[PDB]
Amino acid sequence: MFEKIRKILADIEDSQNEIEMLLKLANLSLGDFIEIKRGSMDMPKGVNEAFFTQLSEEVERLKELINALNKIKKGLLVFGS
Amino acid sequence: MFEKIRKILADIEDSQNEIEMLLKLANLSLGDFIEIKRGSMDMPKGVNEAFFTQLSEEVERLKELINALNKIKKGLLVFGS
Ligand SMILES: [Mg+2]
Numbered sequence: 001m002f003e004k005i006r007k008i009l010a011d012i013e014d015s016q017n018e019i020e021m022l023l024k025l026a027n028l029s030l031g032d033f034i035e036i037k038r039g040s041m042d043m044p045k046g047v048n049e050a051f052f053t054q055l056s057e058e059v060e061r062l063k064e065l066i067n068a069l070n071k072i073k074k075g076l077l078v079f080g081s
Numbered sequence: 082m083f084e085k086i087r088k089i090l091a092d093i094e095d096s097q098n099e100i101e102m103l104l105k106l107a108n109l110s111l112g113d114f115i116e117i118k119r120g121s122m123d124m125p126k127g128v129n130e131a132f133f134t135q136l137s138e139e140v141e142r143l144k145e146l147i148n149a150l151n152k153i154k155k156g157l158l159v160f161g162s
Contacts, residue, residue, distance in 0.1 A: 001111060001112075002097055002100075002101065002111065005093070005097065006094075006097070009090055009093060009094070012086070012090060013087075013090060016083055016086060016087070019083075020083065030082055030083070034156075034157065034159065037159050038159050038160065059157060062154075062157065063154055063157050066150055066151060066153075066154040067154075069147055069150065070147060070148075070150075070151050073143075073144060073147040073148075075115070076115065076140055076143065076144055077144075078115065078118045078119050079119065
């Protein structure tokens with residue numbers, strides 16, 4: 001299990017690094033990205049929307065990795081807690 | 082968000098190391114610890130059950146750290162997904 005966790009943690013670090021780089025390049029905060037994606041915030045002028053496909057994919061990867069880590073953690077539950 | 086995640090990842094590595102040490106001292110696999118805690122495996126003789134108090138505390142901390150990450154990830158939901 002700890003082998004599985006360590007691999008996922010490494011992948012999460014990588015995913016975070018990618019997202020931070022993409023946000024830096026896009027000149028956008030993570031918060032603003034989410035608000036734009038959900039339809040609440042207008043695209044700021046200056047921001048290149050062409051980054052959004054990759055950002056979306058990487059954010060989905062991060063979510064999936066966190067979910068996968070939690071699935072491993074289910075093996076540590078005793079009596080479901 | 083990302084500063085929080087980075088700290089949690091570091092705390093998870095620390096927690097894992099602490100558990101590995103306790104398991105080494107106890108001469109117990111993580112798998113066996115869980116099997117014994119859940120009632121499925123008898124206490125092997127030679128194993129000092131006194132280790133179970135700290136092992137349980139540290140495994141609880143590891144679970145709570147992973148849960149903290151789960152909760153952070155909830156902020157990345159868009160349209161509830
Ligand atoms: Mg094991």
